[PDB]
Known about the structure:
The structure is cut from a larger assembly and holds chains A and B. Chain A is built from no helices and 12 strands. Chain A is an all-beta fold. In chain A, strand 6 and strand 7 form a beta hairpin. Chain B is mostly helical. Helices cover 24% and strands 0% of the residues of chain B. Chain B has one helix at residues 30-41. The longest helix of chain B is centred in the C-terminal third of the chain and has 12 residues, at 30-41. Chain B starts with 29 loop residues before the first helix and ends in a 9-residue tail after the last helix. The chains are: A mainly beta, B mainly alpha. The A-B interface holds A 12, 14-15, 74, 76, 101, 103, 105, 108, 110, 112, 138-141 and B 30-31, 33-35, 37-38, 41-42, 46-47. Chain B: This is Minor tail protein. Chain A: Residues 114-136, 150-229 are annotated as: Disordered.
Amino acid sequence: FTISSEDPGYEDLIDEQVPEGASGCWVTLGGAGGGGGSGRRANSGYRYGGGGGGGGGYIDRVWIPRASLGSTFTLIRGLGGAGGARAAGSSNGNNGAPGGSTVFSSGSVSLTASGGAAGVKGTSSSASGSGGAGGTTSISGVSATGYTGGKGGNGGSSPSSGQSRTDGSGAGGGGGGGVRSNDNSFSGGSNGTSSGPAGNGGRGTDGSINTGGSNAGSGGDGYVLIEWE
Amino acid sequence: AGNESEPKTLAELEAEAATDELSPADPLAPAVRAQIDALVAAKMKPTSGK
């Protein structure tokens, strides 16, 4: 039988037993996306945008025998990282929260698809609004293969789109736009395209008028899929 | 001279020779637990060059 995060009424499993007489399993994992960051709100001065969150890592469909498994397992699935809130005034923004890491382990084996990092706060500073790093993969006990998540885009003094990822890992979110001191607004970037089941990073949000702006995007949830033989 | 008494038991001496109960503490939640265990496993003998 197989279990997935796709199953309605799924729950987080800690120290559940490996199934009775099952010869082994095939595991697949994706990390959650990071939340984006938010930009400075003001009437005046330079107003830079917050960064995009990173995408989650991914570990491919690989076998483990019951001789290498332990008596029990874990299957933690990453929750999507919360996006950075409004400035609540004429001030600097907020960071996002990182995506939850996705973890399988049993006996001698551990397989981990890390969550993507948060998009950084935008400020009055041209170096602000950094995009989050993509989630790395960690492997033990079996010769599995996996792929690192995409970079989240910078906002800041040069806004950018997030890195796209078809390679089983998740894409990054885009960075927020902004406003100059003596001149009109400047554009943000887009979220990257993806096909990995790992969560995409949330978009950052734009440096803006003292009344304006929004919350940054959430990262997407991660994924777990395990097949028992 | 090497003369020794009978072995008097601490009960006969009315001495309260009992060990302290194992002091309880509220643990980290189960999800955090296995994430730490997975972090430690990535620093140890079977993982590549570790």
